Design a protein around this nucleic acid. Structure first.
Lengths: 180, 52, 130, 262, 59, 141
RNA sequence: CGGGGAAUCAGGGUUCGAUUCCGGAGAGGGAGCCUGAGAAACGGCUACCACAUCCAAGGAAGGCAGCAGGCGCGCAAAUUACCCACUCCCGACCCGGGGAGGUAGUGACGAAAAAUAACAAUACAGGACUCUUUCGAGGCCCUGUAAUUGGAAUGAGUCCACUUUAAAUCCUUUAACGAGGAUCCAUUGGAGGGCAAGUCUGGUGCCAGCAGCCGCGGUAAUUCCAGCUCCAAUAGCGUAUAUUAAAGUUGCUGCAGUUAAAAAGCUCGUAGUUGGAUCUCUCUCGGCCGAAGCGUUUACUUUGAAAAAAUU
């Protein structure tokens, strides 16, 4: 007997066909557009999307006036709206099925640094995210997979302790400035 | 490339064209034809069957 | 073989046989009828001084035999009912290590904490494996 | 097992204690007492989880053994004492009295009561025997054996009793049109008016009870505790009036609360 | 941010009475015994093996 | 055809188990003689001592000599032919040594060129043959 | 050992569950007891069996399927650590005890996140666009490659201080030093088809060997062995075994039986399985209702209350 929990999940599913050209094609294209480390990130996002779609498939089969369908579906639509995938106009459980992987990959903090102009390349966005230069509200996030919410999308800043932010230039400026 | 016009290593158009161009260097008894004048995109399963 | 008792009793017989073999093996060393247990000590790395560990290990009733260069002794304990004969070797001197490591019953290697072992000790250990 | 078990594992602990999953292997085994190990609240769980007064088990030791806690007007020093339903807890130093009443969702609420209200409690009579030279006895749900009751008191009724004197004061009879509370099953904590009691000789008397909002439900007979004569309860009630809000309208209330204060 | 828990006692004697002793030994108000468990247990079983006032002699 | 009534369950279930005993893979799992004649005794790996070296002749269209070894398992004492995997590795195996032997990969069926030899040596003297063939570690004795 | 349950899975199902929660059983094998509320108890006793320890040879003492550790068995599994501070339990008990439990150590069982480089200018190489018959020339065009140049930003590390804690360690927070790729250098499998990526170069020459299967090697070896280049996954990746989906190759959903594996030689016959059509609520006791019988009995369906937590 111990005071621990062993509950844990695998967040990806490997594809069944190992080397087919179109699958490797699509995954490499998404790696290029959204600047990712390996294929496990694409598999992770595809598995989360499969989770959401499987939930929607279990919810469509119920009757329209089912209380379970109503509550679970409205909560799921609220969740996908707050992430920044669906739209306030199309808040229906039918439209959840019409979702694509890049609609989730557009919400990563890497791409949100890239699009909003905080950086200039998506690999640049990743290298700024890892090195504690980008904050959200008041917390320095170091993870390039942070799914940024809609209310949280508005204010992403320079992380004032950073040299790009408030002050304190780093070790390289400090060393080169004391050369003479 | 970058952005959204990323033509990758495993592109079906480029790989098919390369498969036809690789088919052009077969043995002389093999009959190829004029698959370059028209655009061929010859897939790996088809080309692997032919190559075999 | 059937008859769960029969399979179990056959397994118990085989267990008895292999335990009798093991017990018959292990009394041949370090006991009242057995000869002494010879332990040869090699400090592999050059930083290690074998006298320090050699005096930590010497305490049991000791009998300090002596030679010209090497210093080996006899140990006897009725606490563990064990007779030991510790003999020390230097790496690099492949003569002594080779001709008395082929009769020693157990080799104890000493290793420095910071590095693995010396290159001379590496040569000695390669020869001893070989 | 060769004798009575003395430890309780945390995950085997009554779910309503809302114990954690990760603090330890064990849970407080409620001592033997006036209430079942499942239908009760050890004093330690009430003191260091519900009220946040103590932070460890050792601070509950330091509190209970100073003699501040009283259950039913008697000083109880046991840290795992089984405190249960309709139960009055008095702390004189803070000068505050709570009642343990079941919550809407089936848990124990902390229901702060007036010190005027702390003088009495309600006991559901469980059996009535006549022993030793024609002397009648009640056994209530707190195992309070009471001699010489009112002869009108029958089984499954309620008696309001005084804590200091230990004697009964007045009884509510089990009759249709009496406000009852459920003490078990899925309907636990829901409070409504009794409409029908149906008989099954041999098995358990199922009872149909109409809630305040018109949502009728049913229980077994043993899970019923009568409080109100008519519609007016004999005690004070939690922040919810005992009506079970369904999930969607609870979310409606939650969203309205977020809209109210921002 | 840094989040901690802090408690404020009324007088010092109440703090001596109610605090865990490891939080008193951080302020020097309390001194822990300096024997190891394994030593205190070997000693306990040793004096278990003896009966009478000779239980006090063993150490 | 099939018995297809509504009270026909025990006939269907008896039929299932009776006919399922004609399944080769199921019978091989559950007759229990395929786990009592199995030399490894349902083990992924066994450990043995080399009795002799053997050259097994190749099968008809393939012309070679495959370098095998007759080893004897420790745990029951059976005699097993094992195939030394890579080129020039039989010299690492010396007479009477501890060998860690695996299956060859077809689950009891003889694999490839070597006839009736269905095991391969993985380790010698508790050093892997892959390290010795790649010249990474040294074999003691 | 059973269950809660685990893996897989469209639907149906298949397989597993020694294993932290519940219930059971046993402390080497059997047996019999003492005391006590509770034991046929073994960190209690008495015997026999099998092992086995100290002898002064008269005797005495056992029981790690508790925690650490050893032997042995093996393909297969960690420290003779620290503490009752947390969780709870025991006692005469705001105090004592706790290898229950917590905490560190070993730990690539498995799981989550996530570095091994980013930008700019040049220097080439291509691709389009424009001007040029072409060759060629330009762009505030694109795309690559550069032990090319420039700066900035960082963490792995070494180290202080704080925090953490029972005392520590770790994570988190600060000063200090700390990065030009010719290293602070990423591996493991593969390049004949299945199956992604070479008819590239050298060696061996149906030898050695490779290869799950089909097959290759007998001299231009597309398969061996190296180099170079390249592919796959990526701090992971090979192999072996068991089991699952693929397998509608176990078929209830949903297989087959002329010729491919298969219908009994033929008929009777019991259990089994299956079986044509047919039929549209009240009398007494109590306050329009409550009690009492219902109606031949079931299958079926629907509702209700009971159904452990963890897992889902």
């Amino acid at each position: 007997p111990v005071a621990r929990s062993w509950v844990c999940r695998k967040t990806y599913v490997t594809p069944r066909r190992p080397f087919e050209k179109s699958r490797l094609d699509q995954e490499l294209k998404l790696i290029g557009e959204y600047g990712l480390r390996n294929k496990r990130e694409v598999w992770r996002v595809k598995f989360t999307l499969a989770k959401i779609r499987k939930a929607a498939r279990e919810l469509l089969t119920l009757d329209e006036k089912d209380p379970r369908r109503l509550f679970e579906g409205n909560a799921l639509l609220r969740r996908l709206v707050r992430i920044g995938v669906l739209d306030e106009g199309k808040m229906k459980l039918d439209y959840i099925l019409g979702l694509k992987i890049e609609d989730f990959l557009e919400r990563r903090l890497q791409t949100q640094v890239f699009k909003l102009g905080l950086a200039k390349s998506i690999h640049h966005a990743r290298v700024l995210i890892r090195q504690r230069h980008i904050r959200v509200r008041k917390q320095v996030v170091n993870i390039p997979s942070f799914i940024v919410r809609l209310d949280s999308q508005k204010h992403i800043d320079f992380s004032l302790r950073s040299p790009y932010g408030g002050g304190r230039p780093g070790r390289v400026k400090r060393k080169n400035a004391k050369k003479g | 490339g970058k952005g959204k016009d990323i033509t990758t290593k495993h592109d079906e158009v480029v790989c098919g064209r390369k498969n036809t161009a690789r088919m052009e260097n077969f043995a002389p008894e093999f009959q190829v034809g004029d698959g370059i004048g028209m655009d061929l995109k010859l897939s790996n399963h088809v080309f692997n069957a032919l190559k075999q | 073989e059937l008859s769960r008792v029969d399979q179990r009793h056959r397994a118990s017989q085989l267990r008895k046989q292999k335990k009798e073999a093991v017990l018959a093996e292990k009394r041949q060393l370090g006991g009242k009828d057995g000869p002494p247990h010879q332990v040869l000590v090699v400090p592999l790395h050059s930083r290690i001084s074998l006298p320090e560990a050699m005096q930590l290990l010497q305490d049991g009733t000791v009998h300090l035999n002596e030679l010209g260069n090497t210093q080996n002794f006899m140990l006897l304990c009725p606490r563990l009912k064990h007779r030991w004969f510790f003999t020390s070797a230097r790496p690099g001197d492949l003569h002594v290590v080779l001709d008395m490591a082929k009769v020693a019953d157990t080799i104890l290697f000493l290793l420095d904490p910071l590095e693995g072992w010396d290159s001379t000790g590496d040569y000695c250990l390669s020869c001893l494996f070989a | 097992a060769r004798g009575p078990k003395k430890h309780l594992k945390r995950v085997a602990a009554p779910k309503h204690w809302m114990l954690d999953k990760l603090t330890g292997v064990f849970a407080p085994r409620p001592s033997t007492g006036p209430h079942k190990l499942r239908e009760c609240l050890p004093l330690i769980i009430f003191l260091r989880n519900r009220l946040k007064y103590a932070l460890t088990g050792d601070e509950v030791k330091k509190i209970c053994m100073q003699r501040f806690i009283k259950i039913d007007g008697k000083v109880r020093t046991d840290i795992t004492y089984p405190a249960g339903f309709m139960d009055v807890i008095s702390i004189d130093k803070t000068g505050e009295n709570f009642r343990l009443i079941y919550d809407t969702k089936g848990r124990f609420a902390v229901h702060r009561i007036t010190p005027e209200e702390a003088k009495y409690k309600l006991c559901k009579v469980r059996k009535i025997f006549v022993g030793t030279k024609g002397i009648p006895h009640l056994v209530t749900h707190d195992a309070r054996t009471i001699r010489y009751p009112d002869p009108l008191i029958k089984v499954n009724d309620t008696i309001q009793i005084d804590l200091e004197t230990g004697k009964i004061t007045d009884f509510i009879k089990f009759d249709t049109g009496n406000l009852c509370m459920v003490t078990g099953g899925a309907n636990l904590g829901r409070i409504g008016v009794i409409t029908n009691r149906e008989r099954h000789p041999g098995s358990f008397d199922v009872v149909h009870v109409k809630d305040a909002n018109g949502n009728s439900f049913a229980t077994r007979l043993s899970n019923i505790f009568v409080i109100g004569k008519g519609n007016k309860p004999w005690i004070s009630l939690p922040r919810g009036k005992g009506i079970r809000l369904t999930i969607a309208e609870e979310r409606d209330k939650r969203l309205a609360a977020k809209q109210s204060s921002g | 941010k840094t989040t901690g828990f802090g408690m404020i006692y009324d007088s010092l004697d109440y703090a001596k009475k109610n605090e865990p002793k490891h939080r008193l030994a951080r302020h020097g108000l309390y001194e822990k015994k300096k024997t190891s468990r394994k030593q205190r247990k070997e000693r306990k079983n040793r004096m278990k093996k003896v009966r009478g006032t000779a239980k006090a002699n063993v150490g | 055809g099939k018995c297809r009534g509504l009270r026909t369950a025990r006939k269907l279930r008896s039929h299932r188990r009776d006919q399922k005993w004609h399944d080769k893979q199921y019978k091989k799992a559950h007759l229990g003689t395929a786990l009592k004649a199995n030399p490894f005794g349902g083990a992924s790996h066994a450990k043995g001592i080399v009795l002799e070296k053997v050259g097994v002749e190749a099968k008809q269209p393939n012309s070679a000599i495959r370098k095998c070894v007759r080893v004897q398992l420790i745990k029951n004492g059976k005699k097993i032919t094992a195939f030394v995997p890579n080129d020039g590795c039989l010299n690492f195996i010396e007479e009477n040594d501890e060998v860690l032997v695996a299956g060859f990969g077809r689950k009891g069926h003889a694999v490839g060129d070597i006839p009736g030899v269905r095991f391969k040596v993985v380790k010698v003297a508790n050093v892997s043959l892959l390290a010795l063939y790649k010249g990474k570690k040294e074999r003691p004795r």
